[PDB]
Structure formats: structure tokens, C-alpha cells
Design a protein around this nucleic acid. Structure first.
Lengths: 87, 87
DNA sequence: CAACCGAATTCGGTTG
DNA sequence: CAACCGAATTCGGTTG
């Protein structure tokens, strides 16, 4: 469909920073776009973590990425989709 | 569906900041979650703008929001969806 | 891996 | 409205 398959990363803001750096330096091919480290800005916040979005070409590149990549355990992730539209 | 109906805002980073502040101060009811001001971090960047995501309860609150809200013209937006999942 | 570097951005809020 | 406040966060990159 018009859903870009993506992975969201929550966790300490500095970790994600470097995780991003790690990803750009060694894994450019395994994903597509990587976001700066953001977070939810209102007091209506569901959590408190920092976040990095990472986008993918195919549900398959995503899945491939996941097998190769050793995500630090202080970092949790979720899978989802957003409109490609918005990249 | 588990698509959270959302609006993305591109534009100068400082504008969005205040726009966010404006939204929280006067419009808390018209939307749901508002993001900090992020941007796409790799050199593989589709653009250059800063971004704020804003999420919604219903496709209807979204649409309602849009009629009431006078978005500064230096600020462009897109409509989309992301997994609710991910908020 | 993340704590740390010093430099650069962004923060929330205020004001013209 | 966005430029400006000074303070606090985040940047990319370097290290142990």
C-alpha cells in the first residue's frame, strides 16, 4: 500500500544519538531514512522517552535490517507504518 | 484500523516551536499529541525542513482542527496516518 | 557501546 | 506571529 514500513526507537536521548551515528556509519544500506531524536512535547505525553524513527524501502528490507542489527538492550522498538506521502 | 490520523508540519524550526506553543496554549482540545520539532538526520534527506507531527483522536477531530486553525503561511502541512500502536 | 567533547540547536515562554 | 530571552538539550564525532 501507501504505508512506509518503519521502526520506532524509544530510550535515553543520548543513546539513540549514537545508535543513529552507528547506523549511518555502518548500515546505510539496511534502511532508508533516519530521524533526529525527538519526543512528545505536550504534558499529554504517553511516555517520556526520546525517539528515533527509521524508515524502510520494503517490509523485507525492514525484516532483513532487524536480523543483522544488534539493538542495544537499553533500546526498545516497535514496528509500524506511516504514509510514504510524508517522507 | 489502527491508523492514527495525523498532520505533519514542515517549515523553519523556530516557527514550528512557537506554533507548538500556540497550539498547546489555546487548542489542547482540537488535537491529541504534538511532537517536539524534529528533522531527517541522514544525508539521504528528502528535504531540509524542521518538522512537527501532531496526532488526532478521530479523522473528524483532525478535520475539525483544520477548519478552526489558522496555520501561518510559512508553514505547510500534509495529512497521513501512523500506527496508534506507536504513540 | 554510551559518556563525553565544545559547538550548535532547541527549549518554553515573552514581547513587540 | 516569529525574533528574541538565557537556560537546557542535542548535534556529529571521538574515545575508552
Amino acid at each position: 500500500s501507501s504505508a512506509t514500513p518503519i521502526v520506532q526507537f524509544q530510550g535515553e536521548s543520548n543513546c539513540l544519538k549514537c545508535f543513529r551515528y552507528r547506523l549511518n556509519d555502518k548500515h546505510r544500506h539496511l534502511f532508508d531514512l533516519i530521524s533526529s531524536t525527538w519526543h512528545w512535547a505536550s504534558p499529554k505525553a504517553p511516555h517520556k522517552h526520546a525517539i528515533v524513527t527509521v524508515t524502510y524501502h520494503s517490509e523485507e528490507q525492514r525484516q532483513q535490517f532487524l536480523n543483522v542489527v544488534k539493538i542495544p538492550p537499553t533500546i526498545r522498538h516497535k514496528l509500524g507504518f506511516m504514509s510514504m506521502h510524508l517522507l
